[PDB]
């Protein structure tokens, strides 16, 4: 029996959904003060080994906050809420393609300047490259990568050129929380 009224409203989560969440959020909460800290979330072992774990972690904290209210915890997970036919049949749900892309985009563009520099791409790359790759091959890839996606030649990737680069991508699905269903 939480504030899951206007919450189930902003995230479009089904009753039992927020329940499995609140329950899950309850488990993540250690000292139990109705909030989470990088501390609490970093306890998720699997996430730690996740090359994006830290960026995912930080995404749960706005501008400078250091704690996540339950509604904030869900505000994020809401982006990965599976899309229902009713969602597409009204305010834009946090799980729309546009918002899923924005979320992913915000993980590349750390300085939140609106564009993905060659460096911001290079950092993401060094995170996901099994075989030891020369810092040069990377610069080359990060380069080519931004190069290919860069349309207005400003050297960086705007959200639109980002969106554009994924038009043939099944983003909806590649970003929908399976388990929840």
């Amino acid at each position: 029996i939480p504030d899951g009224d206007s919450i189930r409203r902003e995230t479009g989560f089904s009753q039992a959904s927020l329940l499995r969440l609140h329950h899950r959020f309850r488990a993540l909460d250690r000292n139990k003060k109705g909030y989470l800290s990088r501390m609490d979330l970093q306890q998720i072992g699997a996430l730690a080994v996740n090359p994006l774990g830290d960026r995912i972690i930080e995404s749960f904290f706005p501008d400078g906050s250091q704690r996540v209210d339950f509604p904030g915890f869900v505000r994020v997970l809401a982006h990965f809420r599976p899309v229902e036919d009713e969602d597409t049949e009204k305010p834009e749900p946090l799980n729309s393609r546009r918002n899923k892309l924005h979320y992913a985009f915000q993980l590349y563009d750390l300085d939140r300047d609106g564009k993905i520099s060659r460096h911001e791409m290079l950092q993401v790359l060094r995170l996901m490259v099994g075989v030891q790759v020369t810092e040069e091959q990377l610069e080359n890839i990060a380069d080519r990568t931004v190069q290919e996606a860069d349309e207005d030649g400003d050297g960086a990737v705007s959200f639109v050129e980002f969106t554009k680069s994924l038009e043939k991508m099944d983003v909806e699905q590649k970003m929908s929380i399976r388990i929840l269903k």
Binding site: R24, A46, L47, I56, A104, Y108, L166, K174, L180
Partner: peptide, 25 residues
């Protein structure tokens, strides 16, 4: 299968996983 598609694929993949792990199994 452009370079982007590949990078982003792995990215969204590592992303979803982390998220699902935040939700727990």
């Amino acid at each position: 299968r452009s370079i982007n598609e590949e990078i982003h694929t792995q990215f969204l993949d590592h992303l979803l996983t982390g998220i699902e792990d935040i939700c727990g199994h």
